[PDB]
Amino acid sequence: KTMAGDTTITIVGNLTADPELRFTPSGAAVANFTVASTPRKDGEALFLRCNIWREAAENVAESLTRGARVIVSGRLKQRSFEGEKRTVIEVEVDEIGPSLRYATAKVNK
Amino acid sequence: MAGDTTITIVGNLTADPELRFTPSGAAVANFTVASTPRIYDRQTGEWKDGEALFLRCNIWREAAENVAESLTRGARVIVSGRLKQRSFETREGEKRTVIEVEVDEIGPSLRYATAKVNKA
Amino acid sequence: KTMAGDTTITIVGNLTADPELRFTPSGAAVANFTVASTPRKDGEALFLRCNIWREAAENVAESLTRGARVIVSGRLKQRSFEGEKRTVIEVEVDEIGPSLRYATAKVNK
Amino acid sequence: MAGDTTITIVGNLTADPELRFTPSGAAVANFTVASTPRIYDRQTGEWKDGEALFLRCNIWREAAENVAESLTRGARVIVSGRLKQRSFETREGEKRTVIEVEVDEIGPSLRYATAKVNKA
């Protein structure tokens, strides 16, 4: 079994940069990216750092680039960093796709 | 609006999205997302496929066209939208109500696929 | 383990009626109620039938009455009923509480 | 607004909500929800307590007063709101950003408790 009583969210916004793909010592892929979601004039931007693993990480790195409008479903995680001792909220991604609101997409596989 | 009930659903399209036009000439696409959950069996110690949930979705205008061009039967999608109840005739003098998703955003999941995004 | 890839939602609205409490042959409590959520003039009402089990069911039946503003977190389930053969969307409740938006509450236990 | 990121969190208050007033005389209450998830261990075949997530929450006006009167340290709550980023001074010339929940609705969970609702 996985987990229960975790805190899920869905964020829609734009990648701040190309996803960063790396491999662990074991050859597991991991991709990191930040989703910037701007409410609305425009409001202040929410920046959520995201992590995704394995085959989905490769698919992300192959498919998406800086500025891509994405829809991301995942679970909030806290990482403790740095100053006096601080925590930052990140997103462990369960699913991501490029939004079709202002774009079309050639889907393969 | 305020006080909308939002939902995120992940699953596979049951069929190619059906694209139609309203009297106003507005595009509208309709499709069903089949969400299969996974159940852990304690006994066997293995995950199994649970019972799919089927939600009918409506999307409008340019997004409708984008979906109808991009997505096909069986595509794995991620859908964010709002649950909306509507009632319909049925002929024998009884209204049936249905709960549908009015889609705000949809995209193909990259869990098992790649996509080439054509930002219009 | 529980489940994964289930479809969760949060609904805020008002109970249409007092919760209905019953006991199964085994003495397990079950409560059923409907949450009516009205968007906005006012929009058209969404009615979601809800189920909750065991001690939380008793707490619900003791605490809440018709018209109560509630916040309900749970998972969508489909039940097949009746006509030709139809399905209805229901909510298997994970947590519920009375909203404090227009009310206060004496909480005990 | 449109394009807000909403969240539902369930957990326990870390302390009594702190109630304060703005220069406008608007009430504001601040509190932290500690959400403990549960982890299934395959090996042992038992659930354990996972690692709590701590989200700082802000609520305003009458709801702030309602919370400050009704809820205490350790209360199990269900919170629906919007994630909001804000930045703050810190003195040594570096701004820190924090992600907080702007609360739309909160209520005490009835999982382990009863409540007597006083609809004002």
Curated annotation (Swiss-Prot), chains A, C:
GO terms for cellular component: extracellular region; nucleoid; plasma membrane. Keywords: DNA-binding. Binds single-stranded (ss)DNA. At low concentrations (0.02 to 0.16 uM), stimulates the 5'-3' helicase activity of DnaB. At higher concentrtions eventually totally inhibits DnaB helicase. It comes from the Bacteria. Homotetramer. Interacts with DnaB. It comes from Mycobacterium tuberculosis (strain ATCC 25618 / H37Rv). The chain holds residues 1 to 119 of 164 of the full protein. The keyword DNA-binding applies. This is Single-stranded DNA-binding protein. Residues 3-100 form the SSB domain. GO terms for biological process: DNA damage response; DNA replication; response to antibiotic.
